[PDB]
C-alpha cells in the first residue's frame, strides 16, 4: 500500500538478464496466482465502487445515462 512502503527497483543491464526479465519475469505471468490459481489483480477501492456507479441502472437524479460528450470523455 502507499502508507510509507519502500520497494527496491533495479534495472537489468546485461543482455541475458534483460532478455530474461521481459520474457520470463514480467508481471503478466503473475496475474494468475500460483498459490490460489485465481487472478491476483483487479479493481480496488476507487474503481470497485466506480464500476458499480458506472454500471448501476438508476442514479438519484434519474436513469444512469450520459450524453455523447461525457461518454466520449470516459475513454
Amino acid at each position: 500500500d502507499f502508507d510509507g512502503d519502500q520497494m527496491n527497483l533495479w534495472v537489468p543491464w546485461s543482455v541475458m538478464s534483460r532478455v530474461e526479465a521481459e520474457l520470463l519475469c514480467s508481471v503478466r505471468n503473475w496475474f494468475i496466482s500460483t498459490k490460489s490459481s485465481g487472478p491476483v489483480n483487479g479493481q480496488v477501492q476507487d474503481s470497485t465502487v466506480g464500476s458499480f456507479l458506472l454500471t448501476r441502472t438508476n442514479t438519484p437524479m434519474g436513469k444512469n445515462v450520459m450524453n455523447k460528450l461525457h461518454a466520449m470523455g470516459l475513454f
Binding site: 546485461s14 543482455v15 541475458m16 538478464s17
Partner: protein
C-alpha cells in the same frame, strides 16, 4: 625421446558463432596456439596432431558472457627426456651463475643445470657447446614453461656397465614392441650412414671408453654391417639379429647379458653368455628378457642419437676447435 601422447583439455570459445563456421580447423589452430612450445602434463608437446574426440560447443552456464567452452581430446607429438638420457648439444649461457646453467639447442628444449662441484665443468666458458649426460634426478616438466628443466653432468663415457640375468622368455607381443624399437634403431642407423663418416669415427673414438683403440683400423659404419673394432674379449652377438630371429621364434634369451665399456656404444652389439663370464662390479639382475631388450635397445637409441646430433652440429672443424677445452679434457679422463 619424441613420441605421441593423447591429451584432454577444455577450450574457451569467445565467439562460438564464428568458431563453428569451421570447427576442426579453428579447433586445431586454438590447440596449436595454446599448447605448442609449452610443456603440459609431464610432456613437452612439440606439434599438435589432429583431434580424436571433441564435445559439442556448449555455452558457458555460470556467466552471462555468452561464450562457449567445448572439451577437446587430441594427440600431440611430445618430447619426453629421461634419466641417463644422452643430449649432444648444450650451450652455456652464464658463468656468473656459479652453479653453471645451460640451454640445449636440439629439437627438445631443455634448460640444464650442470653442478659445479664436479671439476669436469667450470672449464666451459659462455658461448660454447658441450654435451651433457642426464643424471638420475628426473626431468621436471613444470606446466606452462617453454622448455624442460633438468640437471645433468658433462658426458664422460663412464667405464662402468651392468650385467643382466634373464629368467623369462619373450612373448610375441613383447617381440612386436621390440620390433618397433628396432625399427627406430634402423631409422637412426640410416641417418648415421647419411652423415659424413669421418666425423662419426672421430666422435665415436672420443667417447669410446677403453683406450684409444689403436688407429683407424676396422671401419665402423655399422649400418647393416656388423663391423667393429677393439675386440677385447668374448664373442659378441647382434641384438638386432637376435631380435629378428626371435621374431621368427628360434632363440631363447635365458642367459646373462651385458654391454661392458669395451663395446662400441652406438653399435647394436652385446654379449649373451650363459654363466656370467663378465668382470662385473655389480650383482646380476634377475628379470625378464623384455626388460633386457628394452634397456639395451634404448641405450643404443640414445648413444646413436648422441653421436648423430654431435656430427650434425659440428659440421666444420672450426667449431670443434672453438670448444677445444672439452676435447682434451675428456681425452684426459679416459
Amino acid at each position: 625421446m619424441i613420441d605421441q601422447k593423447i591429451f584432454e583439455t577444455t577450450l574457451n570459445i569467445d565467439d562460438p558463432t564464428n568458431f563453428c563456421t569451421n570447427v576442426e580447423a579453428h579447433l586445431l589452430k586454438e590447440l596449436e596456439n595454446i599448447y605448442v612450445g609449452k610443456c603440459f602434463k609431464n610432456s613437452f608437446i612439440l606439434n599438435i596432431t589432429g583431434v580424436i574426440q571433441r564435445s559439442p560447443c556448449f555455452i558457458m552456464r555460470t556467466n552471462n558472457s555468452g561464450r562457449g567452452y567445448m572439451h577437446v581430446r587430441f594427440s600431440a607429438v611430445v618430447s619426453y627426456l629421461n634419466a641417463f638420457d644422452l643430449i649432444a648439444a648444450v650451450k652455456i649461457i652464464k658463468n656468473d651463475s656459479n652453479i653453471i646453467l645451460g640451454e640445449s639447442l636440439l629439437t627438445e628444449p631443455v634448460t640444464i643445470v650442470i653442478p659445479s662441484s664436479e671439476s669436469q665443468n667450470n672449464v666451459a666458458e659462455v658461448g660454447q657447446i658441450v654435451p651433457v649426460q642426464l643424471a638420475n634426478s628426473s626431468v621436471y616438466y613444470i606446466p606452462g614453461r617453454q622448455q624442460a628443466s633438468a640437471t645433468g653432468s658433462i658426458f664422460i663415457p663412464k667405464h662402468t656397465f651392468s650385467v643382466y640375468h634373464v629368467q623369462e622368455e619373450l612373448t610375441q607381443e613383447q617381440a612386436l614392441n621390440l620390433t618397433k624399437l628396432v625399427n627406430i634403431i634402423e631409422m637412426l642407423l640410416e641417418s648415421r650412414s647419411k652423415k659424413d663418416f669421418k666425423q662419426i669415427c672421430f666422435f665415436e673414438k672420443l667417447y669410446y671408453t677403453y683406450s684409444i683403440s689403436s688407429d683407424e683400423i676396422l671401419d665402423l659404419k655399422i649400418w647393416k654391417g656388423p663391423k667393429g673394432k677393439e675386440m677385447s674379449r668374448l664373442k659378441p652377438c647382434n641384438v638386432l639379429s637376435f631380435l629378428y630371429d626371435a621374431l621368427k621364434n628360434k632363440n631363447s634369451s635365458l642367459g646373462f647379458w651385458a654391454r661392458p665399456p669395451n663395446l662400441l656404444k652406438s653399435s647394436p652389439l652385446a654379449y649373451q653368455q650363459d654363466q656370467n663370464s663378465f668382470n662385473a662390479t655389480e650383482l646380476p639382475i634377475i628379470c625378464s628378457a623384455e626388460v633386457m631388450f628394452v634397456t639395451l635397445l634404448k641405450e643404443i637409441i640414445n648413444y646413436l642419437q648422441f653421436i648423430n646430433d654431435l656430427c650434425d652440429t659440428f659440421n666444420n672443424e672450426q667449431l670443434i676447435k672453438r670448444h677445444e677445452n672439452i676435447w682434451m679434457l675428456i681425452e684426459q679422463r679416459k
